[PDB]
Amino acid sequence: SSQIRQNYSTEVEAAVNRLVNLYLRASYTYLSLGFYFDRDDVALEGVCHFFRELAEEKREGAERLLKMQNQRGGRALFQDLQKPSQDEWGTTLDAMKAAIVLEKSLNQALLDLHALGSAQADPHLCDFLESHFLDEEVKLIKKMGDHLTNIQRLVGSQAGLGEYLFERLTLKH
Amino acid sequence: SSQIRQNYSTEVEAAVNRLVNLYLRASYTYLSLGFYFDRDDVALEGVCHFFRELAEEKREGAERLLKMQNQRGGRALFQDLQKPSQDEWGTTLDAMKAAIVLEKSLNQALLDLHALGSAQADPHLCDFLESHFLDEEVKLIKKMGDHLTNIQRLVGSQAGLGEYLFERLTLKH
Amino acid sequence: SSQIRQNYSTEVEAAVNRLVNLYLRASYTYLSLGFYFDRDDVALEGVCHFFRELAEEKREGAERLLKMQNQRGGRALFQDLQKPSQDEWGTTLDAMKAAIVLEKSLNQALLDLHALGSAQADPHLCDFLESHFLDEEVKLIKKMGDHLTNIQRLVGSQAGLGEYLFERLTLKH
Amino acid sequence: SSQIRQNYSTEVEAAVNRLVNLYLRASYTYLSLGFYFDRDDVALEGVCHFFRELAEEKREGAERLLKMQNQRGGRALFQDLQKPSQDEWGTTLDAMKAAIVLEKSLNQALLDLHALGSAQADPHLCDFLESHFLDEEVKLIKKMGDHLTNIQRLVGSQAGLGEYLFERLTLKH
Numbered sequence: 001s002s003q004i005r006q007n008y009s010t011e012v013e014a015a016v017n018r019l020v021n022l023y024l025r026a027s028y029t030y031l032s033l034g035f036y037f038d039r040d041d042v043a044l045e046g047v048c049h050f051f052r053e054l055a056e057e058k059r060e061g062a063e064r065l066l067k068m069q070n071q072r073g074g075r076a077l078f079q080d081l082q083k084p085s086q087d088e089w090g091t092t093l094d095a096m097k098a099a100i101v102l103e104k105s106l107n108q109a110l111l112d113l114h115a116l117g118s119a120q121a122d123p124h125l126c127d128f129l130e131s132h133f134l135d136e137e138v139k140l141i142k143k144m145g146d147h148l149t150n151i152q153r154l155v156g157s158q159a160g161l162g163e164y165l166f167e168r169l170t171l172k173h
Numbered sequence: 174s175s176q177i178r179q180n181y182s183t184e185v186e187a188a189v190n191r192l193v194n195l196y197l198r199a200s201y202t203y204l205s206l207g208f209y210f211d212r213d214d215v216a217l218e219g220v221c222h223f224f225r226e227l228a229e230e231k232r233e234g235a236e237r238l239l240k241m242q243n244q245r246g247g248r249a250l251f252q253d254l255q256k257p258s259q260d261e262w263g264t265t266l267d268a269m270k271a272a273i274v275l276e277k278s279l280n281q282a283l284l285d286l287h288a289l290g291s292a293q294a295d296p297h298l299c300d301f302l303e304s305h306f307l308d309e310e311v312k313l314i315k316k317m318g319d320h321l322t323n324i325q326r327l328v329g330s331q332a333g334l335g336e337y338l339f340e341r342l343t344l345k346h
Numbered sequence: 347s348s349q350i351r352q353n354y355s356t357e358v359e360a361a362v363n364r365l366v367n368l369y370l371r372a373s374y375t376y377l378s379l380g381f382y383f384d385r386d387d388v389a390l391e392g393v394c395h396f397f398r399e400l401a402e403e404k405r406e407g408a409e410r411l412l413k414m415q416n417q418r419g420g421r422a423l424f425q426d427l428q429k430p431s432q433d434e435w436g437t438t439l440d441a442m443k444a445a446i447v448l449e450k451s452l453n454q455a456l457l458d459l460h461a462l463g464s465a466q467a468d469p470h471l472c473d474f475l476e477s478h479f480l481d482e483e484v485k486l487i488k489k490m491g492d493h494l495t496n497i498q499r500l501v502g503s504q505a506g507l508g509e510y511l512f513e514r515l516t517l518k519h
Numbered sequence: 520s521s522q523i524r525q526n527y528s529t530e531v532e533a534a535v536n537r538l539v540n541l542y543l544r545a546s547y548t549y550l551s552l553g554f555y556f557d558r559d560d561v562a563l564e565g566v567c568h569f570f571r572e573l574a575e576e577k578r579e580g581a582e583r584l585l586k587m588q589n590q591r592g593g594r595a596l597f598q599d600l601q602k603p604s605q606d607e608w609g610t611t612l613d614a615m616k617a618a619i620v621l622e623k624s625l626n627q628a629l630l631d632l633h634a635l636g637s638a639q640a641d642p643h644l645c646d647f648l649e650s651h652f653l654d655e656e657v658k659l660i661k662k663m664g665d666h667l668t669n670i671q672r673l674v675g676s677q678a679g680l681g682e683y684l685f686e687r688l689t690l691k692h
């Protein structure tokens with residue numbers, strides 16, 4: 001058992017393990033989104049790249065949480081990882097809307113954990129979220145929102161043209 | 174006559190010579206496709222470049238087969254090369270559909286030769302196809318499929334615009 | 347739907363998706379093993395590093411399979427990922443024994459898929475496993491076996507001493 | 520008298536001066552621990568180096584607090600520095616246990632000051648501790664805990680052997 005644990009509640013420990021699950025779930029979702037846009041009958045490489053990069057980012061966030069759990073003397077506990085919500089993700093617009101929904105849910109979990117940390121007077125936890133998660137998440141959601149606006153502007157009456165142009169001229173490929 | 178030939182059937186030797194003919198035919202087809210897209214009244218440089226590169230690739234595949242024939246102590250035998258199926262190749266979409274048909278026929282010839290090799294217990298032949306042909310062909314067909322999907326998405330109600338944009342923004346020029 | 351799929355059975359497609367699940371499960375197991383050896387009350391950094399590296403390797407194997415699924419025109423389908431078999435992994439010896447069991451199960455899945463590929467006359471699948479999976483797996487299992495032998499030799503009557511020395515002098519830290 | 524002081528309570532000012540004393544006390548303790556492990560009849564250079572480095576770190580923490588006191592317009596007030604708790608520090612294990620006790624006491628003083636800052640609505644103080652003290656302290660305690668676990672594992676029935684090996688193979692020398 002740990003000889004280091006100090007000021008680290010069971011409630012925070014448990015919430016950290018749940019958050020890890022949420023981040024790995026998100027990572028899995030992005031993995032599926034990336035490979036859907038790699039299909040020969042979808043074939044939007046920039047969209048594929050965007051979501052593959054997010055899968056790695058979410059995995060890295062989970063790993064940081066797990067590292068922190070150990071630093072504080074809590075015990076990492078892994079649960080089953082549920083499969084993503086869809087097998088096929090529709091259009092770029094559909095996908096980007098789904099990603100924003102997912103990110104808003106992750107963001108709310110971060111805010112909830114921050115509030116728990118605050119209530120438990122755990123300033124290290126609060127600091128950790130502030131320093132490595134909250135601003136990263138705000139910046140990502142702004143980026144997604146910007147992308148959504150551009151995708152929406154391009155639907156017009158020529159959806160295929162607009163979806164191609166967005167992938168070619170906004171996304172890195 | 175050869176002093177080296179070992180485990181190399183007449184059936185495989187003949188099938189290798191036929192495959193050489195198929196690859197040189199494919200090369201000739203791509204040569205014609207490249208020069209059609211170089212016409213002043215077609216003028217799609219990226220499409221021209223794509224098919225010219227494929228002509229060279231197919232020629233190189235034939236040359237590898239011929240080198241292997243000699244390595245095994247078989248005798249290269251050349252036949253007439255039939256001219257390509259069309260004199261004019263239509264749209265980029267028409268052309269890319271024709272290329273996929275051609276590649277699927279080459280792929281099936283590779284698979285047939287692999288099966289013959291397997292039946293004749295000729296592991297060098299089998300290895301050779303696995304190592305230099307089968308994955309190269311799968312990768313090319315995936316690329317073509319991706320291109321076809323993008324071309325199809327761009328037809329919309331503005332075909333000329335879409336054909337220009339594909340050539341400018343997907344193909345190397 | 348795909349316009350490229352050729353010689354790719356439904357049976358192989360399904361087996362590839364199952365294998366992806368097995369590799370991601372293995373990755374998750376190694377993630378848990380790595381963080382267990384990072385606990386302050388375990389504190390074997392070289393062991394942690396070893397299993398973290400394996401988590402990444404297994405993830406990369408899954409990604410290669412998914413890329414290949416798309417190259418062939420099959421459809422990636424993701425399933426729930428079961429949590430690892432244990433929450434706490436015992437000694438270095440216990441852990442390395444569990445890893446070998448896991449690797450032997452992955453190896454047998456690769457061999458089974460190879461046999462299916464052979465039966466379905468799918469030489470691209472067979473080649474793919476030969477070229478990127480079978481030898482990598484044999485090499486990993488040999489490494490694990492070597493490690494197990496060294497760990498076993500060091501138990502003696504001074505288990506803690508031996509476990510420290512193995513981590514310091516065999517594993518990269 | 521200061522012309523700058525704003526939102527800086529007398530309670531925080533006093534608590535900052537007390538914390539400075541605690542950090543300089545800790546520095547003095549580590550100085551004594553370092554020179555004990557430099558004795559010819561102890562002679563554990565890596566252990567000496569470890570504690571000498573900590574003496575400098577604790578001094579640097581005090582200096583940062585003093586700099587911040589002045590930045591806020593408070594007045595540094597120095598008190599007597601009590602000598603360390605022991606003249607001789609026993610084994611490496613004894614020493615590392617004493618260091619963890621000391622660090623836990625410093626950590627609790629940081630948490631107490633953070634709570635006071637929070638209650639006094641002094642976000643600069645809170646930020647300062649979060650940014651330069653809380654995570655540094657968590658990381659140090661994790662390191663010490665890891666070291667303690669390794670030292671404990673090496674006691675076995677051959678304490679001298681284990682103490683030598685830890686110093687040679689874990690600590691920088």
Ligand SMILES: [Cl-]
Nearest residue numbers: 079080428429
């Ligand atoms: Cl379960």
Ligand SMILES: [Cl-]
Nearest residue numbers: 251252253254
């Ligand atoms: Cl003739």
Ligand SMILES: [Cl-]
Nearest residue numbers: 082083425426
């Ligand atoms: Cl389900």
Ligand SMILES: [Cl-]
Nearest residue numbers: 597598599600
């Ligand atoms: Cl005095």
